[PDB]
């Protein structure tokens, strides 16, 4: 959107998926441990557009703020060990289960600018995933449906599932939620192309920790009136996340 420049260290779990040749932003992502990065499956696999990256095709840049700059002494650049896409990711109809994990080649060193986000447990999800509760999304994507100089941030309220459904002809599932302001609410903002795979986070009032509740997934344009941004429901897919991390590292 319709967002603002982030503060330094405001989103130390934000990851940029970077294309090796040619050099350019591919997607957002997030750090969930010293060796695991969470993103959207469509960032990695989208057959209608001939998108199918493999490990060696990209890089993970962590600790960033500036979009284009090489941030010497601050960012870390990691290689991909292996990519895992949800086996029931539905790229043909509606991006259901739009989620992927990426294992890093070597562990990343935490710093003031690099630090993992929490993943929700069932009670924090129950507590926080309520219509009208606001979350925050971050990314280096389009500013309108140019490109920013530094990381952008917007706070957006979760929308009731009926309103989400009535706003689109797409078949929405329990593995998605939508967020954004209604026409009448005045204020606006949204994620857009380029923010894909980045996190929708919320700050628990119970333990003052940030949790990643969503992944930027899709939308009908960007910040259009009466449309909403759609997010992968991280808690709903946690069973799969754990199994992957359990069995693969």
């Amino acid at each position: 959107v319709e967002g603002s420049d982030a503060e330094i260290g405001m989103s130390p779990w934000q990851v940029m998926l970077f294309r090796k040749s040619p050099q350019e932003l591919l997607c957002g992502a997030s750090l969930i441990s010293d060796r695991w990065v969470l993103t959207a499956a469509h960032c990695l696999l989208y057959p209608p557009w001939d998108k199918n990256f493999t490990e060696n095709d990209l890089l993970v840049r962590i600790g960033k703020h500036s979009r284009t700059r090489y941030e010497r002494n601050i960012e870390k650049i990691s290689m991909l060990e292996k990519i895992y896409i949800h086996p029931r990711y539905n790229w043909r109809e509606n991006l259901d289960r739009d989620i992927a994990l990426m294992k890093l080649k070597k562990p990343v060193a935490f710093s003031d600018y690099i630090h993992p986000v929490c993943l929700p447990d069932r009670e924090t999800a129950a507590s926080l995933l309520q219509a009208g509760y606001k979350g925050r999304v971050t990314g280096w994507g389009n500013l309108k449906e140019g490109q920013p100089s530094v990381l952008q941030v917007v706070n957006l309220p979760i929308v009731e599932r009926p309103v989400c459904k009535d706003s689109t002809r797409i078949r929405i599932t329990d593995n998605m939620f939508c967020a954004g302001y209604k026409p009448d609410e005045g204020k606006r903002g949204d994620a857009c192309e380029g923010d894909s795979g980045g996190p929708f986070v919320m700050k628990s009032p119970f333990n003052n920790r940030w949790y990643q509740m969503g992944i930027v997934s899709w939308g009908e344009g960007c910040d259009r009136d009466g449309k909403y941004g759609f997010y992968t429901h991280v808690f709903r897919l946690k069973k799969w996340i754990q199994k992957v991390i359990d069995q693969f590292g």
Partner: peptide, 26 residues
């Protein structure tokens, strides 16, 4: 175990400019 606690904010008890907006909505 320190997930979700930002070195430049929660770890030093500093708040960012808009996190209160989130709190107020909860």
């Amino acid at each position: 175990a320190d997930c979700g606690l930002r070195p430049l904010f929660e770890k030093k008890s500093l708040e960012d400019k808009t996190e209160r907006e989130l709190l107020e909505s909860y």
